[PDB]
Tab-separated table of N, CA and C (backbone and C1' of nucleotides) and ligand atoms in Angstrom:
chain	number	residue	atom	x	y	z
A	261	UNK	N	3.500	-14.339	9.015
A	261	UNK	CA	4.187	-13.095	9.314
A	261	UNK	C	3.199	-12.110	9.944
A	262	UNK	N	3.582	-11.143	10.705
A	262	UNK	CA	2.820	-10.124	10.944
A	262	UNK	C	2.885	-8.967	10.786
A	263	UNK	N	1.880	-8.286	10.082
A	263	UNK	CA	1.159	-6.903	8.957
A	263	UNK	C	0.259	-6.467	10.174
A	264	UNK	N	0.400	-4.619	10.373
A	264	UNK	CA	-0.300	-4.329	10.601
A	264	UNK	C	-0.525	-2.756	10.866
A	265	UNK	N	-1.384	-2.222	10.091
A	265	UNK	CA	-1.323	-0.495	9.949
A	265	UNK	C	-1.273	0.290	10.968
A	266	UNK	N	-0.221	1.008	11.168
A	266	UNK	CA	-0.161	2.034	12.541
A	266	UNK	C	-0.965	3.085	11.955
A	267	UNK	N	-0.171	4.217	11.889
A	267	UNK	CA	-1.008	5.858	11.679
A	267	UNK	C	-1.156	6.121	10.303
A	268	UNK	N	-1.697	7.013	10.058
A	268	UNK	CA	-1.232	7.847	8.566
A	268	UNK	C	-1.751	9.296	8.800
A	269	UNK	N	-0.887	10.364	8.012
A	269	UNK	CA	-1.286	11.748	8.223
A	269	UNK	C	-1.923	12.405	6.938
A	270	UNK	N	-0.680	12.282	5.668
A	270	UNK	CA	-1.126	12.211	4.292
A	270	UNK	C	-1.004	11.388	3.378
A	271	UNK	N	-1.897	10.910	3.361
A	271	UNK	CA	-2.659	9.820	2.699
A	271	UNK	C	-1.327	9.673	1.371
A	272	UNK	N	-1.133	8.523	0.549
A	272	UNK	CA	-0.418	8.631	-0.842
A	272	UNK	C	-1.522	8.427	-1.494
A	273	UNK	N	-0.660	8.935	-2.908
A	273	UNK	CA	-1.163	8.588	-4.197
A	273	UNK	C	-0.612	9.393	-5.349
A	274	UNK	N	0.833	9.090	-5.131
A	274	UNK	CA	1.562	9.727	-6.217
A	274	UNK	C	0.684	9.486	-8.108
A	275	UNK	N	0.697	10.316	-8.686
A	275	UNK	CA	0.339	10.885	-9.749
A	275	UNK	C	0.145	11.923	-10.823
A	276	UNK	N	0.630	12.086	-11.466
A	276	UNK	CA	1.039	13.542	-12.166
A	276	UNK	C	2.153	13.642	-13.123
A	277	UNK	N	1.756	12.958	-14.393
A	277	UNK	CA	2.679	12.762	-15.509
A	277	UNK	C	4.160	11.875	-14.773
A	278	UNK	N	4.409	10.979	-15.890
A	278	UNK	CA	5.363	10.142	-15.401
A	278	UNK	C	6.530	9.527	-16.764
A	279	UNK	N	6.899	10.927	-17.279
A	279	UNK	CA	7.741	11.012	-18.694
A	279	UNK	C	6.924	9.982	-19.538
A	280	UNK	N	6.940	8.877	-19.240
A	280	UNK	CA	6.276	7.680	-20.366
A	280	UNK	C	6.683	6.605	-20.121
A	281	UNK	N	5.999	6.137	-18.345
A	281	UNK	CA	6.332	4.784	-17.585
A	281	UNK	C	5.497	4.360	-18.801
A	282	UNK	N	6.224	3.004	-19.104
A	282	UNK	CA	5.436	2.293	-20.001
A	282	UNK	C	4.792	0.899	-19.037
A	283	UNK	N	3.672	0.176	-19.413
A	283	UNK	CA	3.412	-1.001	-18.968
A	283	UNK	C	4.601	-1.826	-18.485
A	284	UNK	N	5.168	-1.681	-19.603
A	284	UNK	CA	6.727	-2.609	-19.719
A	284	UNK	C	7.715	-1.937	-19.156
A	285	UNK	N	7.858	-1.347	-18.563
A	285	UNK	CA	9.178	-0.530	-18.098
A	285	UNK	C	9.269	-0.291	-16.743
A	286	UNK	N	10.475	-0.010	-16.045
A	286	UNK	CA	10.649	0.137	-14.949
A	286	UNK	C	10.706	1.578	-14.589
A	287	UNK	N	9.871	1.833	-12.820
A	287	UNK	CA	9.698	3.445	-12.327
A	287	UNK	C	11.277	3.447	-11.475
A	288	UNK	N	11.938	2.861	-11.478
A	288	UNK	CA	13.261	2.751	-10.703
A	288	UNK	C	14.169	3.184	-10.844
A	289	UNK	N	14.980	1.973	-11.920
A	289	UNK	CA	15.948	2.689	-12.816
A	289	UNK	C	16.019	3.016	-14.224
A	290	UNK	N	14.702	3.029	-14.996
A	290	UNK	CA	14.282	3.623	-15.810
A	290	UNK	C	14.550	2.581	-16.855
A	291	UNK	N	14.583	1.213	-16.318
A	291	UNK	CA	15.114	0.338	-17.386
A	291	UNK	C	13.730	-0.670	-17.888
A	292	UNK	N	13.496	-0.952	-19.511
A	292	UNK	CA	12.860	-1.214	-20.445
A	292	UNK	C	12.820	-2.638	-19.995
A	293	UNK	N	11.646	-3.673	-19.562
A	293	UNK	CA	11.520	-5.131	-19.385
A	293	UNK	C	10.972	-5.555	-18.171
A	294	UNK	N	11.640	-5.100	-17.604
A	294	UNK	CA	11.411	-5.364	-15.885
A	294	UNK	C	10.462	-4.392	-14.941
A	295	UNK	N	10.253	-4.837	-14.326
A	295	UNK	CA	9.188	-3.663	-13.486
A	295	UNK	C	10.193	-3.640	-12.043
A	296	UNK	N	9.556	-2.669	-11.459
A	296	UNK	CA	10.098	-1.795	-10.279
A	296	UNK	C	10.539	-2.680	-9.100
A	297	UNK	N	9.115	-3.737	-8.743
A	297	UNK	CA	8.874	-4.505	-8.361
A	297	UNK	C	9.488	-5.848	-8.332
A	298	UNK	N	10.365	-6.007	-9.642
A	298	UNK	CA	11.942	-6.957	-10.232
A	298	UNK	C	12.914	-6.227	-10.435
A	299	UNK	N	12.863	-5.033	-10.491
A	299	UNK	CA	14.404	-3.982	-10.720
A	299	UNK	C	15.166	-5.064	-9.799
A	300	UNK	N	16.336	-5.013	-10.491
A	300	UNK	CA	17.923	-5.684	-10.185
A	300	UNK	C	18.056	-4.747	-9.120
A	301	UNK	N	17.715	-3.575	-9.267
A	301	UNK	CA	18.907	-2.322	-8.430
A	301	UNK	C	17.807	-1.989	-6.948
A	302	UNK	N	16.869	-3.230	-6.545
A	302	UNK	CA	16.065	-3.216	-5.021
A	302	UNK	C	17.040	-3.468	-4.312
A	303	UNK	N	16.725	-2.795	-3.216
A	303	UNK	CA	17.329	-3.026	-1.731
A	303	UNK	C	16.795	-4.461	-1.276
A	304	UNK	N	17.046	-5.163	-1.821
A	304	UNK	CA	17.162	-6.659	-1.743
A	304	UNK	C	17.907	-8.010	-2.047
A	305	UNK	N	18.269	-9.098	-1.356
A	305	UNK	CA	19.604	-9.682	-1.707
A	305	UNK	C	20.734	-8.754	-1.786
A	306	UNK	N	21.793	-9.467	-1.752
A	306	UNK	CA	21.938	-11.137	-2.171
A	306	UNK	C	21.681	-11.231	-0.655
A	307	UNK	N	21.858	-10.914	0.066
A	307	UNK	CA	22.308	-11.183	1.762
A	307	UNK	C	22.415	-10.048	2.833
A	308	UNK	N	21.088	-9.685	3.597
A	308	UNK	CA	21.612	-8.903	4.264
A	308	UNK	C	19.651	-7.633	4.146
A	309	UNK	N	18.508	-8.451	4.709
A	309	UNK	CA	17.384	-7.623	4.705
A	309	UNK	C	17.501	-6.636	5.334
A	310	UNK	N	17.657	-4.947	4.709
A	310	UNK	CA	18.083	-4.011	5.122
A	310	UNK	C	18.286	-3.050	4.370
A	311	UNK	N	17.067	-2.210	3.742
A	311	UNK	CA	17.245	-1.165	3.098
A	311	UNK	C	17.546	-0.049	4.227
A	312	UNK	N	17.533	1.157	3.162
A	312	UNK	CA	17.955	2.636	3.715
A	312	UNK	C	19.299	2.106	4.717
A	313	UNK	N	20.386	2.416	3.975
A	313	UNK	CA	21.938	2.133	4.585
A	313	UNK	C	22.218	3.717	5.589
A	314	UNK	N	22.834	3.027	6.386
A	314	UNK	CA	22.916	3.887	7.210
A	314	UNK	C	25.143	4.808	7.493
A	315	UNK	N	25.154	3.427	7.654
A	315	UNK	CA	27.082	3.740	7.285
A	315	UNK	C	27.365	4.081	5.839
A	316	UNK	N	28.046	4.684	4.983
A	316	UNK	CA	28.829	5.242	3.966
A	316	UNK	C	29.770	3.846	3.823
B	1430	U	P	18.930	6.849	-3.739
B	1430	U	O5'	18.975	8.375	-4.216
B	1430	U	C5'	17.772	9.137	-4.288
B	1430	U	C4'	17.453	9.471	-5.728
B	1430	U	C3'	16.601	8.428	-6.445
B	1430	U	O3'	15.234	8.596	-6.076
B	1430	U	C1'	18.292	9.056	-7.925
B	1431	U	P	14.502	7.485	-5.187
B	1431	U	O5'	13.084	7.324	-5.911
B	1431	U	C5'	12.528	8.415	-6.641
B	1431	U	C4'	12.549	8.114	-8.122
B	1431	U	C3'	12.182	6.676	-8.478
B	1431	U	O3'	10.763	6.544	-8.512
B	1431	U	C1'	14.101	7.205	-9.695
B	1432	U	P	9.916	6.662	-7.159
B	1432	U	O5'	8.983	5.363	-7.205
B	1432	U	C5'	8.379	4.961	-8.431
B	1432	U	C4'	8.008	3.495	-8.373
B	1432	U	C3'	7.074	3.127	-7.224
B	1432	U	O3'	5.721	3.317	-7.634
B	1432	U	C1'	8.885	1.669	-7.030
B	1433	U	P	4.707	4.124	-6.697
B	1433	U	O5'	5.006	5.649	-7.073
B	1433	U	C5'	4.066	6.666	-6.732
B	1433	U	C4'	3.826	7.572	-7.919
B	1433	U	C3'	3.613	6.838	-9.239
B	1433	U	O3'	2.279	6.335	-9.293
B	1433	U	C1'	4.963	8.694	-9.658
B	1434	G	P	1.741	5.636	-10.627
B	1434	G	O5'	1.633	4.096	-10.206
B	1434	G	C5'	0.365	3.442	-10.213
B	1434	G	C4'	0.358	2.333	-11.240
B	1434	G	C3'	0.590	0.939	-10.664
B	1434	G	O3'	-0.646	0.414	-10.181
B	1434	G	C1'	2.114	1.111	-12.422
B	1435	C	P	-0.647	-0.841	-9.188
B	1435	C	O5'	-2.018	-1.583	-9.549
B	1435	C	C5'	-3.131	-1.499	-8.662
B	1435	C	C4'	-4.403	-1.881	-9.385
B	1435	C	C3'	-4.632	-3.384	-9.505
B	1435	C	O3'	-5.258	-3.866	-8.318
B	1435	C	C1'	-4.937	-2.503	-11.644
B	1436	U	P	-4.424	-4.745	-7.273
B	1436	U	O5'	-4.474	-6.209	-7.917
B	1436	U	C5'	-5.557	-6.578	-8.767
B	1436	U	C4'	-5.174	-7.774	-9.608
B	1436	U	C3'	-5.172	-9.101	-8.855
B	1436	U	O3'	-6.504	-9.639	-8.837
B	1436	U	C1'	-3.126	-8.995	-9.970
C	1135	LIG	ZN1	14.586	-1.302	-12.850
RNA sequence: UUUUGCU
């Protein structure tokens, strides 16, 4: 596949209290087991690579 | 809406 960094202006690095993400818990939908990264509720699957929807 | 979390 091909990766490759265009620009950046401000830098990330979100940080600054986070209620009480646990190791175990998800930053998503706030659900206990799964991480963000496996949240059910990604713009991913079943069919159709294409986050940020654009039609209603 | 929420990835604000090292492989
Ligand atoms: Zn989740």
């Amino acid at each position: 596949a091909t990766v490759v960094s265009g620009q950046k202006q401000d830098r990330q690095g979100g940080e600054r209290r986070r209620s009480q993400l646990d190791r175990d818990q998800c930053a998503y939908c706030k659900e206990k087991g799964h991480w963000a990264k496996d949240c059910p509720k990604k713009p991913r699957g079943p069919r159709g690579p294409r986050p940020q929807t654009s039609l209603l």
